[PDB]
Amino acid sequence: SDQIFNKVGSYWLGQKANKQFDSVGNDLNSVSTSIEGGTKWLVNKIKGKMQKPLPELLKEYDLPIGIFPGDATNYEFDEETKKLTVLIPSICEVGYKDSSVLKFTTTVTGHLEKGKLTDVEGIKTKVMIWVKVTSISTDASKVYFTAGMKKSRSRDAYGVQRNGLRVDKF
């Protein structure tokens, strides 16, 4: 004797959805460098000309001090800097009871103007206070040493009158 009935229902549903966000990246690139090659002389002719009549002109755009050796007083300027740079052959530190001691660096920068070179960057000068911007005011003729009349030196003898030796030349 049977009348058994067990119906089981089955439902179906399918949730379909999709959200996939990703992000695209990017990177930066910047490579740069530089060298120096202003001095160029494959010939070694021992005289302040090298191979071109240039060095006279540099000192010519500069003041009549010529510093002393003729090696220094080079007239150059940088591009990015736009500050003029005078090349001194070697770093000379000159000290005497004059004041104390003065440091003349090689590649010094400053505001060069026809007549006077104002505000340097490399020449630490102590005449009374130690300052690295004490500059050389010249009247395109007479010179007033780096400080501004604080040290009285006559252009007459060799331009700038102090006993220093830029240790690059003998």
Swiss-Prot record:
Domain of life the protein comes from: Eukaryota
SUPFAM superfamilies found in the cross-reference section: At5g01610-like
Record-given protein name: Uncharacterized protein At5g01610
Phylogenetic classification of the source organism: Eukaryota, Viridiplantae, Streptophyta, Embryophyta, Tracheophyta
